[PDB]
Design a protein around this ligand. Structure first.
Ligand SMILES: *[C@@H]1O[C@H](CO)[C@@H](O)[C@H](O)[C@H]1NC(C)=O
Length: 579
């Protein structure tokens, strides 16, 4: 109400024609000014803000109210409340929220185990980083899952939101969701899973789209733009019922940083050994023994030749819940987290069999000083060729059993080898026996690293207030992908990551000239594979449907114009200027 009076006051003192500034960072401003010339009477709210038909009034409305146009210094900034978030160092409020429904018992038990580690981490982050003056956000979390990787991630996200001081409302039923949920521009963010999102749409019906900018959707395997755009997915013949939400794809939150079109949420790799356990393990030398990754004996089918090669150099151990198990294997059965990590500390090699795909267990092994033998996949596995991935709303390809371990950890902790190739396996086992490796845990999978990441998303990632401005455009590094290469690939092989919020700044002739791409001619297509550049004719094809901007996808004929950003080593979700 007073924001309307505030903007009207600015317009009352403004010239007829704003001398418009440079549009850098705001590529939709001019198109929306033109839209206002035709449409500022279609809704009385624009006039309620003081819009009077002058183009300067359009500009003022679009910058000050909707943030689609650059901000001008209309008013001075006054160099001088209760609304601030304070970090929490006590869990009783969170437990009392979860003590209402009973499949929260597993999560409460995990949080109680990890409580001291979480509290040390939030205190440590606040001692290193300036966390003052953050606004307390009102957050809804709806766990459709409740109506194991999924549970761990939910637990650590909820814990992180809580430790950072935000006001959380937890919903775990349709009835709870319905009661809670009862331009021109209560709850500010809504964390939800894929099951819960379907429930959200049904509870709200067609008006759900008014809340969609607030959604952060936990989606372990990721959703690519080709599948997120419902009409495009249909035009490609995709039969999967998944995807089709038409969200900004950065609103999907993944388990590992494998899909740069999405955001990486992750989780914490729990530490089960306390200081007494650790001191007792410095007692005992790590043995020349291996431990096979895989709890179900059916995972071991046809792995005998591979294990025999390992068995030539090392004892072979297992934790199996026994047809396919060689008789020389020492089976411990299922172990507690503490007993498992004791075993990992006496173990030189954690042996992947090819399945399961990208879980936490290899990171747990590496964090206890084991090397991981990581089977390589050629062809890479994807929804195109692997029954286990049928219906996934993404063509993402796995190049090994644990692509994160392959790409972001690597040797000497991770030896990515063809398990069928005896020479490659032997070369790895021999080098692992004679190598010095220390326990290693990527910062992003620690309590403190997860808090830093989630804090940055809460403070900086915003889809509800017009122009996306984070990561900052200063971080953009433009690369040309060759034909047959995706934008995801061309950033990754240069130790960068694709940043999909930057595509919109690379989508016309004038913008392309900033990066020494000169288009003699140009056209518009609605295609995930553009902006594209034909270097023979210097013909550019730009994006005609902004929801199809896509890090994934290789152009068969032309070069792709690809927006990369730097990432902080060990914190891939953030650029150095992202905070
Ligand atoms: C270490 O963990 C064991 C759990 O069996 C517990 O008995 C012991 O009190 C713990 N010691 C410390 C110092 O945390």
């Amino acid at each position: 109400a007073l924001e309307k009076i505030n903007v009207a006051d600015i317009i009352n003192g403004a010239q007829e024609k704003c001398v418009l500034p440079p549009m850098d960072g705001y590529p939709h401003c001019e198109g929306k000014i033109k839209w206002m010339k035709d449409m500022w009477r279609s809704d009385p709210c624009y006039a309620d803000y003081g819009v009077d038909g002058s183009t300067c009034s359009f500009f003022i409305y679009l910058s000050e109210v909707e943030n689609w146009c650059p901000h001008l210094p209309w008013r001075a900034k006054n160099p001088y409340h209760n609304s601030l978030a304070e970090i929490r160092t006590d869990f009783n409020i969170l437990y009392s929220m979860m003590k209402k429904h009973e499949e929260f018992r597993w999560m409460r038990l995990r949080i109680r185990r990890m409580a001291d580690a979480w509290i040390q981490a939030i205190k440590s982050l606040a001692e290193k980083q300036n966390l003052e003056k953050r606004k307390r956000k009102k957050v809804l979390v709806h766990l459709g899952l409740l109506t194991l990787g999924e549970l761990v991630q939910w637990s650590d996200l909820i814990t992180s939101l809580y430790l950072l001081g935000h006001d959380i409302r937890i919903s775990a039923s349709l009835a709870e969701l319905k009661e809670i949920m009862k331009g021109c521009p209560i709850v500010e963010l809504i964390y939800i899973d894929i099951v819960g999102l379907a429930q959200f749409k049904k509870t709200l019906g067609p008006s759900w789209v008014h809340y969609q900018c607030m959604l952060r959707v936990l989606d372990s395997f990721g959703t690519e733009p080709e599948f997120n755009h419902a009409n495009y997915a249909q035009s490609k013949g995709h039969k999967t019922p998944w995807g089709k939400w038409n969200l900004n794809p950065q609103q999907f939150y993944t388990m590992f940083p494998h899909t740069p079109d999405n955001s990486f949420l992750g989780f914490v790799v729990e530490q089960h050994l306390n200081s007494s356990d650790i001191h007792h393990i410095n007692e005992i030398k790590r043995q020349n023994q291996s431990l096979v990754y895989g709890k179900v004996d059916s995972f071991w089918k046809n792995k005998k030749i591979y294990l025999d090669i390992i068995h030539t150099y090392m004892e072979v151990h297992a934790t199996v819940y026994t047809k396919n198990i060689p008789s020389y294997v020492k089976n411990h059965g299922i172990l507690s987290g503490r007993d498992l990590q004791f075993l990992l500390r006496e173990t030189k090699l954690f042996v992947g069999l090819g399945f399961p795909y990208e879980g936490p267990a290899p990171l747990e092994a590496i964090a206890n000083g084991c090397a991981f033998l990581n089977p390589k996949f050629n062809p890479p596995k994807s929804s195109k060729n692997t029954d286990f991935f049928i219906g996934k709303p993404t063509l993402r390809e796995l190049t090994s059993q644990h692509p994160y371990a392959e790409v972001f950890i690597g040797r000497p902790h991770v030896w990515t080898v063809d398990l069928n190739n005896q020479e490659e396996v032997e070369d790895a086992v021999k080098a692992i026996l004679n190598q010095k490796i220390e326990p290693y845990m990527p910062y992003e999978f620690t309590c403190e690293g997860m808090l830093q990441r989630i804090n940055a998303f809460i403070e900086k990632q915003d889809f509800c207030h017009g122009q996306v401005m984070w990561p900052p455009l200063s971080a953009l590094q433009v690369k040309l992908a060759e034909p047959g290469q995706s934008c995801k690939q061309v950033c990754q092989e240069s130790q960068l990551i694709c940043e999909p919020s930057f595509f919109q700044h690379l989508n016309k002739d004038k913008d392309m000239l900033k990066y020494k791409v000169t288009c003699q001619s140009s056209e518009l297509a609605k295609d995930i594979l553009v902006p594209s550049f034909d270097p023979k004719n210097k013909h550019c094809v730009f994006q005609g449907d902004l929801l199809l901007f896509s890090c994934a996808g290789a152009h068969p004929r032309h070069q792709r114009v690809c927006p990369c950003r730097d990432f902080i080593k060990g914190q891939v979700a953030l650029c150095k200027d992202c905070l």
